[PDB]
Every structure is written in C-alpha cells, then in structure tokens.
C-alpha cells in the first residue's frame, strides 16, 4: 500500500512550472 | 491499494503551468 | 483499488494551464 | 475498482485552460 | 508500505521549476 | 490642463482589487 | 500641464491589489 | 510640464501589492 | 520640465510590494 | 530639466519590497 497525504500548503504564485503541489505516482 | 489525499491547499495564482495541485496517477 | 480524494482547495486565478486541481488517472 | 472524489474546491477565475477541477479517466 | 506526508509548507513564488512541494513516487 | 491616456492594456484576471486600469483623478 | 500616457502593458493576474496599471492623479 | 510615459511592461502575477505599473502623481 | 520614461520591463512575480515598476512623482 | 529612463530590466521575483524598478522623484 502507498499513502500520499497533502495538506495545508500555501502557494503564492506559480509561473511556467510543472508538478507543483501534486501527488504524482 | 493506492491512496491519494489532497486537502486545504491555497494557490494564489497559476500561469502557464502543468500538473499543479492534482492527483496524477 | 485506487482512491483519489480532492477537497477544500482554493485557487485564486488560473491562466493557460493544464491539469490543475484535477484527479487524472 | 477506481474511486475519484471531488469536493469543496473554490476556483476564482480560469482562462484558456484544460482539465481544471475535473475527474479525468 | 510507503507513507508520504506533506503539511504546512509556505511557498512565496515559483518560476520555471519542476517537482516543487510534491509527493513524487 | 491635465491629460490622461489609457490604451492597449491587456489584463488577464482581476480579483478583489481596486483602481485597476483606471484614470483616477 | 501634466501628461500621463499608458500603453501596451500586459498583466497576467492581479489579486487583492490597489492602484495597478492606473493613471492616479 | 510633467511627462510620464508607460509602455511595453509585462507583469506575470501581482498579489497584495500597491502602486504597481502605475503613473502616480 | 520632468520626463519619466518606462519601457520594456519584464516582472516575473510580485508579492506584498509597493511602488514596483511605477513612475512615482 | 530631469530625465529618467528605464528600459529592458528583467525581474525574476519580488517579495515584500519597496521602490523596485521605479522612477521615484
């Protein structure tokens, strides 16, 4: 089993970016 | 089994970006 | 079994972006 | 079995974007 | 079993970046 | 005499803002 | 005499801001 | 006489800011 | 006479800032 | 007479700053 948890992350500004704040499997 | 959890993430502004705040499998 | 959960995510503004705040399988 | 859950996501403004806030299979 | 936990991370500004604030498997 | 000229300005997305792209006197 | 000229300015995304791209007198 | 000229400025993303890309007198 | 000229300035991302890319008099 | 010229300046990311890339008089 694989568990991925993402919580309470604040991102100000994202430009021309990939795989940011994501659960990539 | 694979578990992906995404919660409570604040994103200010996103421009020309890919796979942001997503559960990609 | 695969479980993907998406909850309580606030997105300010999205421009010319792909796969944002999505459950991609 | 595949389970995809999408809830309580607030999107401010979306322009020229693809696959945003969607359950893509 | 693999457990990945992401919480309470503040990101000011992200430009032309990859795999930032993400659980990559 | 006061001259104010506003031309050819492209605005992507505006949220909770005041006095944007305006000639304020 | 006061001359203010505003032309050809591209703004991606504006959030919770004041006096942006404006001729304020 | 006072001359203020604003041209060809590209702004990616603006958050919680004041007097950005403006001719303030 | 006072001449202020602003041209061809690229700004990536601006957060919680004042008097950025402006002709302040 | 006072002449101020601003051209071709690239700014990556600005946070909590004052009087950046501006013609202040």
Numbering used by the authors:
A (entry chain G), B (entry chain E), C (entry chain C), D (entry chain A), E (entry chain I), F (entry chain B), ...: 13 to 37
Lines quoted from the article behind this entry:
Human islet amyloid polypeptide (IAPP) is a 37-residue polypeptide hormone that is co-secreted with insulin from pancreatic β cells and plays an essential role in glycemic regulation. IAPP forms amyloid deposits in the pancreas of >90% of individuals with T2D.43–45 A single genetic mutation resulting in a serine to glycine substitution at residue 20 (IAPP-S20G) is associated with familial, early-onset T2D.46,47 Recently, cryo-EM structures of IAPP amyloid fibrils assembled in vitro for the wild-type (WT)48–50 sequence and IAPP-S20G48 have been determined, as well as those of patient-seeded WT IAPP. Here, we used cryo-EM to determine structures of amyloid fibrils at different times during in vitro fibrillation of a disease-related variant of human islet amyloid polypeptide (IAPP-S20G). Strikingly, the fibrils formed in the lag, growth, and plateau phases have different structures, with new forms appearing and others disappearing as fibrillation proceeds.
Interestingly, the IAPP-S20G variant generated two major fibril polymorphs, which are each structurally different to WT IAPP fibrils, with different subunit folds and fibril crossover lengths (~45 nm for IAPP-S20G and ~25 nm for WT)48. The balance of sub-unit folds underlying the different fibril structures also changes as assembly progresses, with the P-fold found in the earliest fibrils in the lag phase, followed by the L- and C-subunit types in the 6-week sample, with the L- and U-subunit folds dominating at 22-week time point. The structures can be divided into different lineages based on three different 2PF cores.
